């Protein structure tokens, strides 16, 4: 019995222990193992496996024993015995990820290596003790050594993917080692050369690049790592050489955003690329415009706009996700504001694309199936951190002029009355940003009587001034002044 495996380890006959561990490995390698008899009668097995993990095990049966380690690490109620200091020492020593034993190991094949990698990510996903002990032990310098040692090592997708996934878990949990990798090791530089190796598959590079699934998911996970590390207090942190490195990441993302991932990973690929594109230095952002003229190119105002049109298409494709908006729609909108605000052909192009579909002049400013109508309906959503994003978007795309803003938006007073201090004074001024006072169509006829916060229906005729004033009718101040 697999219950009797823990008793067979007590006698410790090598064939019995190894064969029972082998068959238990191929049986229970799946997620969510045994249900009743494991929290009382496999924690003993967990204790004895931690004890035999403490000594260095023999050169054979390693995959089997470490697979049992991984399998018992899949359960929840054995991490307390598998997440100690010396157990983490043994698992890192077999993992070759600790700096305590770096010039030691004779050249290991990748199989036991990736198995130990899997045990490490299984523990570090769900042990805060392992979070503390990883921040204590500083595995990330040897992890950075491994991720830097790729152009000469032929390490495949499984080992590669899995140890940078371990990096993603540690950088998701520990902000101290986040900033430690940020400053102390130039993780953006090492991640950019990792991104160059992922893109270097050469997928008919002169037409649109087409990344296959393995390297696609590697690029997706290293973009998770990049977004994990790139956000922290970077908003106005400008340097020339660091801005050049950020610009190299920007032009690499420019070449990457117009791609298509294999299988069905293209949407999540695009979302992670724009997530990485979001929090960069905005002065370094406008290199998204820096695209040449080409055959098959949406040339507007003499300049290319193909990647901006593509990410606008991504925005319209992404908007339909109604269960989780603030993940999916915020960073594209913010980066579209910043690239629109730093470039007059960008501002003029999007101001000529999304705004000047006017509504039918009668009906309300929120009904209609157009994208402008979608953004109008989105601006009153109860998420403040998408409503301010869309408000800033329509303001900076409306050429920073409030009478243009009210001339198609009725709630824009409630939008921008707090964005600036009321907006009815000198602030967000008259446009030196081209901006001439002539936007026109056959519209504004009804806006010659522009009853503005509503669409302007002229049916306001109940007067009701029956006698005098305030007679039980506007003497409601007597309950008001306390308020």
């Amino acid at each position, epitope marked *: 019995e697999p*219950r009797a495996v823990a008793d067979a380890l007590e006698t410790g006959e090598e064939d019995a222990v190894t064969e029972a561990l082998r068959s238990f490995n191929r049986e229970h390698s799946q997620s*969510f193992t045994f249900d*009743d008899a494991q929290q009382e*009668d496999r924690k003993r097995l967990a204790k004895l496996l931690v004890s035999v993990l403490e000594q260095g095990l023999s050169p054979k049966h390693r995959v089997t024993w470490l697979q049992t380690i991984r399998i018992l690490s899949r359960d929840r109620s054995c991490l307390d015995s598998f997440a100690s200091r010396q157990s983490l020492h043994a698992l890192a020593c077999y993992a070759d990820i600790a700096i305590s034993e770096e010039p030691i190991p004779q050249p290991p094949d990748m199989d036991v290596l990736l198995e130990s990698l899997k045990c490490l990510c299984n523990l570090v996903l769900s042990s805060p003790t392992a979070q503390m002990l990883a921040a204590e032990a500083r595995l990330v310098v040897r992890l950075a050594e491994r991720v830097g040692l790729y152009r000469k090592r032929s390490y495949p997708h499984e080992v590669q993917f899995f140890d940078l996934r371990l990096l993603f878990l540690l950088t998701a949990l520990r902000t101290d080692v986040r900033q430690q990798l940020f400053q102390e090791l130039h993780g953006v530089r090492l991640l950019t050369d990792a991104l160059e190796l992922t893109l270097g598959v050469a997928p008919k590079e002169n037409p649109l690049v087409i990344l296959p699934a393995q390297e696609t998911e590697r690029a997706m996970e290293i973009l998770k790592v990049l977004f994990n590390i790139t956000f922290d207090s970077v908003k106005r942190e400008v340097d020339e050489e660091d801005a050049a490195l950020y610009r190299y990441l920007g032009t690499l993302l420019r070449h990457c955003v117009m791609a298509d991932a294999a299988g069905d990973r293209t949407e999540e690929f695009h979302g992670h690329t724009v997530n990485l594109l979001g929090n960069l230095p905005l002065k370094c952002l406008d290199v998204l415009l820096a695209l040449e003229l080409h055959e098959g190119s949406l040339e507007f105002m003499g300049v290319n706009m193909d990647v901006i049109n593509a990410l606008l298409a991504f925005l319209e494709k992404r908007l339909h996700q109604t269960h989780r908006l603030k993940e999916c729609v915020a960073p594209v909108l913010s980066v579209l504001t910043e690239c629109a605000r730093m470039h007059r052909p960008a501002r003029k192009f999007l101001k000529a694309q999304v705004l000047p579909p006017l509504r039918d002049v009668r009906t309300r400013p929120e009904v209609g199936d157009l994208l402008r109508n979608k953004l109008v309906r989105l601006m009153t959503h109860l998420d403040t951190d998408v409503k301010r994003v869309a408000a800033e978007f329509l303001f900076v795309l409306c050429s920073e002029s409030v009478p243009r803003f009210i001339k198609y938006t009725g709630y824009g007073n409630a939008a921008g009355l707090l964005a600036a201090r009321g907006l009815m004074a000198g602030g967000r001024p008259e446009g030196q940003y081209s901006e001439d006072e002539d936007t026109d169509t056959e519209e504004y006829r009804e806006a010659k009587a522009s009853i503005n916060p509503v669409t302007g229906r002229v049916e306001e005729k109940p007067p009701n001034p029956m006698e005098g004033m305030t007679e039980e009718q506007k003497e409601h101040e007597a309950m008001k002044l306390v308020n």
Partner: nanobody
Amino acid sequence: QLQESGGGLVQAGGSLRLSCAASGGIVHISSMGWFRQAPGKQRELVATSPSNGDIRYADSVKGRFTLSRLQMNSLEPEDTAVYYCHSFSYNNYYGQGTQV
């Protein structure tokens, strides 16, 4: 939806023939066990006999049992818990039961 019928006799010093039958229809159950939920601690594994060879009784006592392919024999006054059968391929198909 897998459920059971675990009753329970509110008197010290007697037998307990309980049942835990198949209703949910999901495959890969293959092992029906028990738990002892005393009113001041975690629920406790007692009749862990997975019908996988030889049965395994209570680790603490030897109140003798069987499995229905149950009958708890010779209770004591104090070893009191909220009883449940436990089959499993998901994890926790407990069901509902009683206590003495």
